């Protein structure tokens, strides 16, 4: 209402009550004019490799992105969550846009001037029928910034469709976003909508205190037998004789078991110590990849697998983990001290190590003159009796992904981590309404190319309720907790420096508490 | 209300429910000051030919024009309409103007500055009594642009009255539009009105799968007789003897029939291949024309006739079809690759080909010493028993025309195509209210010639409900559908390019489905 009344108030806090936590984040955003109000066909450059070809469209619209956990949880909030809860999941969200300001920019005479345009509008619509290509869930920049005092730029919306090389095909779709209905907002108007999450499984924010190969009573023998010797000493040599034993603690690898470890898709191993790696360019040639319509894509991060085995923390899968950048890290070819490499070590209780074989299978039929032969299994699809953990989530990491619209999707938990949703939180798209500049006094049928330079700013609030599954642990000894480091330092972790720059010093997962298998 | 509240929201979409479809289009418009607020007498230049003389008036007003199908239907919407429906017609419309902004322009010191004038008005009125000359329905530029992201200039209103040469006559009428009541709108005011279409016949969006000369059972003979031989061999010569046959499939051209093809007004034939045409200037001398009060007018497109016969797709009538320009085509003397020539081939089942004779009639009375003589019929008025199809409509083409206010009008379907309406959607005229600049401090009776430079912009919505007649076809074999081309291409049809320019690559008619006669 009017011009002198704010359309909303600042809400940032977390409310912990019972099995629920509610997070609220308010930020200040700025929206420019994109593409000078045009839709543009875009494509890969002429010299691009086949694996890098694309075709699509850039739009004049922007969109809002709060699909990272930091956007909602403070570092102290994240600690409170991960130290006390076995699981959590999102329930509902609220979204608000308010305190909208449109401003005119006159760059005349090399001097910039900025004035309020109290009459201009912004257009906002939710894609609640999921009729546009969903580009959230691709881990793009442009989120609400983790620190509440920071002002962020709204990212530009674009999408890809079917390409053959740099060219489109008959099935390529083009979308005009102005062909949707949208709200027009003038200074003093606000925008709200609500969303309910579908029923989704809790994220498992625990590690297992048991391993899948150690589930039996070590004090008692099995009543089942296994083949323990295939020959026996006969005089001066051996002869073929099959012999059988019941497995106890002494031969614990040989016990009959009910379950199998999860599936595998083997990754190459790289060392954080530089001298242990081969002196060669293998970042692509040695990469784990999939092949789709004659194209190779890197499998990154791929299926959830343990980063390393015991005492090998310096090793990680080539493209098998999420890697976050440190504050101020650049885009291209940075050193390893500039990035933060997550560790999925916790899931090695049930999941194969990413850089090892799944196991060994028999390849032949032995006999008197043929010895038994085995082969390493480097790729293992799911088997009946397999169990596994999903990838962990991080404070820096994504929250949800849209499950692709397909006939079949096995265990549709997104591989970068988080909650797979058939109807995710809808895309919220926004743009400044074009305001034409001074027209000619003689009619012209050509479209207007001359506009008044404008941008918008405002406040955005996002409120998410999360359902908690509290830890109820009967173990006697104390557990592992996330804690801040104990010593003195120049800067405090998760703080601003003397220049006002907020930084996140390390990745924080969720799995600190333990449970039995 | 106020200054900080938008007076409306953006509505673009199509709603298909039952036998109805509702289209909504929102666009952004800009309105300049025309004629520096004056009415001006206008006329043809002194050296103009008699056929080109005119007299009339240009006004300071603008008007809104949504009389093209693209203004309402998206290309995908048009496909959905034409592939599934035997007919459609308009039922009612809604029109909105909202988010009005008046702006002052100061061009002082060679520097332009643009500021909001929150106090100035625009004037808007509908001519709902049809008391002004109706210039819609003359296929003028200035429509709402087909692509929703484009901003368009409001065209200037003008009209013609009776002329003798470049001079007026006693019966010439002058109209002051400010002699009508109109709404005055300030920033925060909006304008709405509703309109109901009269009962109008459905457009036939089908082609016929039968021809008017092939309607009989080919297996059975007729019981009627025709004169099949007028002489018979007699000795060494012939003698006059009248003989009669019943017509079957073997002589199917001779069968007695109930109906005649539609009327004709013959056009000259031109080839799309350049070498087949005469090397001469015949675009006017060879043109089909009518003569009104000593003036010649080109007949364009004229009566609905088939563009060509079988296997002659390269031929078209000289002025007998609608010709649309390709994106970026110019005004004067463009090549044939710059224009799109429609094809009315579908109606050759019932309508004469535009470039052929209607038929042959007898011209004399034969006898022993006089042979029978016939003549080609190059112009045929309507006869009892004639049937015909009207011209097709196009996505680029016009929708309605105003039926002229006359004593008699046979089959008042407009010749450029679409719906003839005795009370068409009324003209919506708009202009900026003049705001005088700084006056003298001594009184002067002279009229003000000095004003503040202003223009206006806003949003316009148009919503039309269409009644559908669904295809209910019992044929066994599959039909013809409009489809997008199958192959790869640089650009997609009906899309923007890399520079943001929307284009319409071809004309699309309505007649893909078939029906029996």
UniProtKB/Swiss-Prot annotation, chains A, B:
Which UniProt keywords are listed? Capsid protein, Clathrin-mediated endocytosis of virus by host, Host nucleus, Host-virus interaction, T=1 icosahedral capsid protein, Viral attachment to host cell, Viral penetration into host cytoplasm, Viral penetration via permeabilization of host membrane, Virion, Virus endocytosis by host, Virus entry into host cell
Keyword Translocase attributed: no
GO cellular component terms, alphabetically, are: host cell nucleolus; T=1 icosahedral viral capsid
One GO biological process term: symbiont entry into host cell via permeabilization of host membrane
User: What practical purpose does this protein serve?
Assistant: AAV capsids serve as viral gene transfer vectors that have been shown to affect long-term gene expression and disease correction with low toxicity in animal models, and are well tolerated in human clinical trials.
Where in the cell? Virion; Host nucleus, Host nucleolus
GO molecular function annotation = structural molecule activity
State the protein's purpose: Capsid protein self-assembles to form an icosahedral capsid with a T=1 symmetry, about 22 nm in diameter, and consisting of 60 copies of three size variants of the capsid protein VP1, VP2 and VP3 which differ in their N-terminus. The capsid encapsulates the genomic ssDNA. Binds to host cell heparan sulfate and uses host ITGA5-ITGB1 as coreceptor on the cell surface to provide virion attachment to target cell. This attachment induces virion internalization predominantly through clathrin-dependent endocytosis.
Comment field on protein domains = The N-terminus of VP1 is sequestered within the mature capsid. It contains a phospholipase A2-like region and putative nuclear localization signals.
Q: Which family does it belong to?
A: Belongs to the parvoviridae capsid protein family.
Q: Recite the other comments.
A: The ratio at which VP1, VP2 and VP3 proteins are synthesized in vivo is about 1:1:10, which is the same as in the mature virus particle.
- Record-given protein name: Capsid protein VP1
Biological source species? Adeno-associated virus 2 (isolate Srivastava/1982)
Name the gene. VP1
